[PDB]
Amino acid sequence: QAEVLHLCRSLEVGTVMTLFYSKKSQRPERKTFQVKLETRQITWSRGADKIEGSIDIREIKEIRPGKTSRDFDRYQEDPAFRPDQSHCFVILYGMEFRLKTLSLQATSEDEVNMWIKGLTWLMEDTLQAATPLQIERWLRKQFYSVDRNREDRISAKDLKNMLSQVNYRVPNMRDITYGQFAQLYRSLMYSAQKTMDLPFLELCQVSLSEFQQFLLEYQGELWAVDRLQVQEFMLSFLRDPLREIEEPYFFLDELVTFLFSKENSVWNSQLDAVCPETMNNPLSHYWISSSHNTYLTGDQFSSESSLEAYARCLRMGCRCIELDCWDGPDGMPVIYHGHTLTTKIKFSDVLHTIKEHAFVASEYPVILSIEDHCSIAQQRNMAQHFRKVLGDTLLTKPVDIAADGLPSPNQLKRKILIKHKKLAEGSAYEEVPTSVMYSENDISNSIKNGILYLEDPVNHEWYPHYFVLTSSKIYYSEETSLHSSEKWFHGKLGAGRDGRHIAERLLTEYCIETGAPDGSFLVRESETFVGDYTLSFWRNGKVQHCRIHSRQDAGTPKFFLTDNLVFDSLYDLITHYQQVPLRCNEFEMRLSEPVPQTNAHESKEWYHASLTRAQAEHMLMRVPRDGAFLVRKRNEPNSYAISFRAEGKIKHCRVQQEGQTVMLGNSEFDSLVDLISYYEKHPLYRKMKLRYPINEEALEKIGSGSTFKCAVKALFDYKAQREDELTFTKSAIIQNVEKQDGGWWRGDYGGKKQLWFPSNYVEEMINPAILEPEREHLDENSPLGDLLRGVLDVPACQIAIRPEGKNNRLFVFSISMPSVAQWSLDVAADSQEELQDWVKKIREVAQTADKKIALELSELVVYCRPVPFDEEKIGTERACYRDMSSFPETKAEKYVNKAKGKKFLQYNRLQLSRIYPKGQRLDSSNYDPLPMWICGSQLVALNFQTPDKPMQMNQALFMAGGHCGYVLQPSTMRDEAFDPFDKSSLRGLEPCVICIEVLGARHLPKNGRGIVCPFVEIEVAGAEYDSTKQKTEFVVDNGLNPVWPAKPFHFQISNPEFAFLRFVVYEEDMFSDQNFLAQATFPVKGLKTGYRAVPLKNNYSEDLELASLLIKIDIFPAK
Ligand SMILES: O=P(O)(O)O[C@@H]1[C@H](O)[C@H](O)[C@@H](OP(=O)(O)O)[C@H](OP(=O)(O)O)[C@H]1O
Ligand SMILES: [Ca+2]
Ligand SMILES: [Ca+2]
Secondary structure, three states: OHHHHHHHHHHOOOEEEEEEOOOOOOOOEEEEEEEEOOOOEEEEEOOOOOEEEEEEHHHEEEEEEOOOOHHHHHOOOOHHHOOOOOOEEEEEEOOOOOOEEEEEEOOOOOHHHHHHHHHHHHHHHHHHOOHHHHHHHHHHHHHOOOOOOOOOOEOOHHHHHHHHHOOEOOOOOOOEOHHHHHHHHHHHHHHOOOOOOOOOOOOOEEOHHHHHHHHHHOOOOHHHHOHHHHHHHHHHHHOOOOOOOOOOOEEHHHHHHHHOOHHHEOEOHHHHOOOHHHHOOOHHHEEEEEEOOOOEOOOOOOOOEOHHHHHHHHHOOOOEEEEEEEOOOOOOOEEOOOOOOOOOEEHHHHHHHHHHHOOOOOOOOEEEEEEEOOOHHHHHHHHHHHHHHHHHHEOOOOOOOOOOOOOOOHHHOOOEEEEOOOOOOOOOEOOOOOOOOOOOOOOOOOOEEEEEEEEOOOOOOEEEEEEEEOOOEEEEEEEOOOOOOOOOEOOOOOOOHHHHHHHHHHHHHHHHHHOOOOOOEEEEEOOOOOOOEEEEEEEOOEEEEEEEEEEOHHHOOEEEEOOOOEEOOHHHHHHHHOOOOEEEOOEEEOOOOEOOOOOHHHHOOOEEOOOOHHHHHHHHOOOOOOOEEEEEEOOOOOEEEEEEEEOOEEEEEEEEEEOOEEEEOOEEEOOHHHHHHHHHHOOOEOOEOOOEEOOHHHHHOOOOOOOOOOOEEEOOOEOOOOOOEOOEOOOOEEEEEEOOOOOEEEEEEOOEEEEEEEHHHEEEOOOHHHOOOOOOOOOOOOOOHHHEEEEEEHHHOEEEEEOOOEOOEOOEEEEEOOOOOOOEEEEEOOOHHHHHHHHHHHHHHHHOOOOEOOHHHHOOOOOOEEOOOOHHHOOOOOOOOOEEEEEEHHHHHOOOOOOOHHHHHHHHHHOOEEEEOOOOOOOOOOOOOHHHHOOOOOEEEEOOOOOOHHHHHHHHHOOOOOOOOEEEOOHHHHOOOOOOOOHHHOOOOOOEEEEEEEEEEEOOOOOOOOOOOEEEEEEEEEOHHHOEEEEOOOOOOEOOOOEOOOOOEEEEEOOOOOEEEEEEEEEEOOOOOEEEEEEEEEEHHHEOOEEEEEEEEOOOOOEEEEEEEEEEEEEEOOO
16 A cells, blocks of 8 residues: 555656657657656656656556567667567557557666556556546546646636537636636536436535435445445545545535446446356356457458457457468468458467467456468477467366266366367368358459559549459459748738738737737738738737838848848748837837638638539539538628538538637537548548549549540541641541640541540540449449449450559559440559459459368367258257357358247257358458347357447447356256247246436547537347337537436336347437447346446447446336
8 A cells, every 4th residue: 555655656756768659650769758646647748848648547458568569560670679678568558449559668677667567556546446536537637738737727718619629518608727627517517417307306415314315215225224334335436535534425416426427337346257156057058258350450351460459359358269370481370361461470479469368357268269271280380389388278188078068167267279170080181071162252262352553533543442353253342541831921912902901800800809919910912012011910909000121132031120120031020029029100019919811711622702502513413422522602601511422412511600710510610721621531421521622623634534445526627737647527536545745645537547636626535434333233242241332244344454554553454345435444553463463363254154180280179179060960969069160140140040040049058159250241340149149159259350239249248247258148048948039938037127218428429529419329139029229319519418308218128138238329410410429238137226327338348438328227027
């Protein structure tokens, strides 16, 4: 305890260490680091002072000693950066699958040791800190993020902006210190929610006998019949040692804050411990947390394989992980997804990662699913490395030779098992006996896979697409992954008094609307003295003007106010008079705030001062890509619209300007220019960013880039003026046209070949390949899955290499189709060798019109022996509990339906089944695990890197047991009558009736710049007969503390042993779409009753800071 207070006190002082950026362009550099205790952040002051970096300690997942990091690996042979493991350590932090890393280089080995032990305690105390203290640190984090920390007092509009950044919009405007800021927060959170229906509930206070009456009458906490128990419960909440030495008391607002806190969670934390009693059934009786292609960080085709993903999965409590082993460059296999562009990591590194992390989250057994493409020698090296590195951790022999069933999880604690094909006794080949020429159309069975490039027909940039060639088709995806600068210089505003009036308007509106100081100013070009300038500044509610003289005399420039000092640049003049007063119109004034320009949009490619809705729509409908956009002024003042194309249709939204800001819905920006720049970087509508500014120039040049056998149409007659020129008549189609800049193209017409003609005497015929493909009847299950954009029928295509490339791409081929004149796609590869490979294989596809296993590795396979699935062995003496079978999603669906589900249940009570996603989910999306689980499948393998609903259900299921990774399947479903498609199979199992009312929410996260308009979807997920969804209405412009109207919900669950209660918070955005904000999913068996908090998670299932709902939940039958 004293050691902890000593430790924390030392790091708030600090330490200096070198930083290895997770960015390549950057070169390592040093800074000082410290732990602001009042907020629990790791801040790194750049140099002993200014604060330039920060990490929230609550996001730290691992503090790892050594140089084990990607950053470190980027400089491991550079001798300038070959540090020492003793001097290096790594913080892994974040709330997504791919954790962020802080890779640091210290000097002492007790320096690193204190930090590591400091953060370890800090991490644990921050995470379990009582909620009033977490709120208190959040309030400080918001505070130390504006002008406060300096003046120690923030403005009143700083508050408006900070509140909007935390999802709260005050109706209209209404300096403050932290104590007053925290007072305002607590008062706002309570006032905004005093309307919630709370029968139990002018800052009154609730006492001990009152809180005890609550816990008992409403919360069903029977322990609270002991008063001293509640006493501590209330003191475990407040955590103020003052006010403690008297009877505990809550204020009303502290009671409401309690109702929202993790201390009031709907989730019974008693189910967070392992129940060792439930860990004694055969392995086949457990749901086992399982990962598919564990090495991958992203999609299945081109993402990075990472050691870090193994560590993340095992630390999320995953127990069955997957290794895809291929022959490596040095006799040691590599791991990556075969036949793709995913990066390769080394088998040896993976094993050490697995060793280091397999039992941090759980003592329970780990299963390595080994997809093996290695030669016999590399299989031997694997077998040798498994045995050496894992030692007694590896399972090498059965637990019970006379058993008739798999061993229990308890019997396999701290064991790692190998799942791998096994030789028949005395054979050199697996007894493999399944004959299936139903070759799945996926990237495994394709002819060639790769990334190739396609010119965008609108901006003429090359973009990468995934290409897949099969034996008859090419599938391609959607695209993959001086003074004039100064704010105070406004240039020429007008040519006469119009410019003076514009300057007076700009300066006046700025000063009035912002309460700007005297001396606020702008500079413009002089309307009266050419080459000179005019300074305008605010003084006594009036605008003052003075001439700034300019002289190019004797070579160098000379700027000066009349009768005043001479300066070399306009910047120097202004910078000087912002520090000491000028004299102007007999007045003394120091320049202060620069007046910003407000109409920078007026010269942008996308801006149209005069344009109707109908004209904008006609313009954008000429553009065959989504993200075509323009901004138009509207007929009413201070009003604009964005017009943009999405899903082949045109949409519009109004942008209103209110003073020095602009608004789009509730999203506030500084200017139209800043607004558009924001939505070029972030999506505006669904996943659509603003990409192409549409004006006359852009429209003219659309689809103009073809090269292969191009035709053009003569617009006029042309008589050859030289012997190398073509002669032709109006409307003539000139063929095979070679296009070049400089005004002259080359083509065939009238018998003459490749003669020159004027470029602007023709229009280029349309290349239909530039148009969007019809995507409505496109194959849902191509090798590309949901990423598919287009299909080409190879026998109807022709291919030709362009030897000179095009558009700064050296390696280009052209696909055409003889029966569709002028249809052509130009396609670039990254290398001449890649180009040659694609061309030869495509052309070959067109001209068509029609495993040994090392004993040393085999010996390590004790259980989890893969055999072809034999439905007829189910229930007979021929079923071997050591044999297992794997099921690709689509095959598994054939067994988890009404017809075969009960027999799949029978199989799974004795033997393991592994389910994994279909090959076509190249995007690493996940299938629904519940229909697999409810038929007793144990190894339901999901892409852990993907933040979708299947992974949210996975982490929810394994919440029972605290993510130990094994959950005992309930006895009712290991009954032989249990049928997931027949609730009559359950017999008289008591059902469960849930009544819920969503009362309010706090600290909801944002989805962009606006303020969310949230609604809550409540779901029960189990068998089909139990599954249903309900939702609340959305509330307007509030994520910080919304409350919802009355809408009582009822759910009835016939099988509460396989049932999940799921809460999803959505926002209704301005386009009437519904966007995920947060979620919490629970097994129904762990639900408490009463007025309960619902602590909210992100889509990766990480705890959000403070975010929660308050519900009223009643469960029947009564406990
Ligand atoms: O890596 P991909 O492309 O997703 O390929 C499938 C997937 O990874 C499965 O997890 C794997 O299951 P099993 O090892 O459990 O069988 C299967 O192996 P298989 O070809 O040996 O059946 C692979 O085909
Ligand atoms: Ca695999
Ligand atoms: Ca990791």
